[PDB]
Design a protein around this ligand. Sequence first.
Ligand SMILES: CC(=O)N[C@@H]1[C@@H](O)[C@H](O[C@@H]2O[C@H](CO)[C@H](O)[C@H](O)[C@H]2O)[C@@H](CO)O[C@H]1O
Ligand SMILES: O=c1ccn([C@@H]2O[C@H](COP(=O)(O)OP(=O)(O)O)[C@@H](O)[C@H]2O)c(=O)[nH]1
Ligand SMILES: O=c1ccn([C@@H]2O[C@H](COP(=O)(O)OP(=O)(O)O)[C@@H](O)[C@H]2O)c(=O)[nH]1
Ligand SMILES: [Mn+2]
Length: 287
Amino acid sequence: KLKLSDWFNPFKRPEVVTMTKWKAPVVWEGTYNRAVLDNYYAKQKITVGLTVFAVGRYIEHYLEEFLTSANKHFMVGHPVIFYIMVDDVSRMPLIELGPLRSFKVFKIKPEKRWQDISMMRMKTIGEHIVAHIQHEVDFLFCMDVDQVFQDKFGVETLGESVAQLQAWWYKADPNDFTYERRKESAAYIPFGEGDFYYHAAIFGGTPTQVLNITQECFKGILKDKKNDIEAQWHDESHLNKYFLLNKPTKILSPEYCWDYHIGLPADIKLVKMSWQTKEYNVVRNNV
Ligand SMILES: CC(=O)N[C@@H]1[C@@H](O)[C@H](O[C@@H]2O[C@H](CO)[C@H](O)[C@H](O)[C@H]2O)[C@@H](CO)O[C@H]1O
Ligand SMILES: O=c1ccn([C@@H]2O[C@H](COP(=O)(O)OP(=O)(O)O)[C@@H](O)[C@H]2O)c(=O)[nH]1
Ligand SMILES: O=c1ccn([C@@H]2O[C@H](COP(=O)(O)OP(=O)(O)O)[C@@H](O)[C@H]2O)c(=O)[nH]1
Ligand SMILES: [Mn+2]
């Protein structure tokens, strides 16, 4: 089987956090041996999935740029399947795909509140895992559409359960993190607890693990509805509670999901994905 030291050298990045207390790697540029891993996973003949949602004007603003960039940069050299969930298939951009990429598209119901569009992804992803994704892929990523791939996002990111460090908070102390802090919410994390602040824009794992992630988060979302409370950062609050309880087996550095509004500091050596500028006045239709 694969050993961590076969592909991961933390000493290449001595000035950042490269290992967690529960022995998961934090993958930074310089630490990974992609050649070793490409050879390993090609011998297993893996396929990698990617889900993305675009509901409303998120389709026109973001979906083409997301997919064009994913085609170029996501798991190059391996078969990939893009799963695209939209409310209006007639507005789908049908871009040309390259070798080892294919896709399929699903029509979904548009939830009335943007907060519920975001949170209902957890329910829909689990339904699709059970119905087909579990039979199609070895690993799955679930991503926001309001971002663009900038460089290779490869097999060094694969694992049983994979979390993303949020770009603005990776050096912060846990008591500064924007976790949900009301005990009445299923997402509550008390002061004095927490490892990292994870970004809900990227998470992944085997289909089995992603099913558990998404099912447990959606259970918390529904429980909160019954208690008349809505977590401060919606599905992200619940995801952070999940990963506190069920530690990820791999974490990605902020290089894998970077906000250029921060600037480009010394620690961010090669950006693999960048955030799109927010445009909520146009793309969201409720407060
Ligand atoms: C240090 C600080 O306050 N930085 C904020 C960012 O947190 C903020 O990003 C939003 O962060 C929330 C969680 O707090 C969530 O992850 C959102 O998806 C994300 O956009 C950013 C927004 O422009 O502003 C900075 O000032
Ligand atoms: O009206 C909506 C609200 C959300 N989304 C999807 O849900 C994700 C999360 O919402 P958003 O990116 O707006 O949250 P932010 O990252 O800005 O906090 C988006 O990237 C889209 O994939 C969408 O398609 N339409
Ligand atoms: O139909 C509704 C809308 C809200 N609320 C309660 O507070 C949450 C906020 O509701 P939302 O508008 O987000 O609707 P829902 O997700 O139920 O479609 C709900 O789930 C309910 O528990 C209400 O009692 N009924
Ligand atoms: Mn987003």
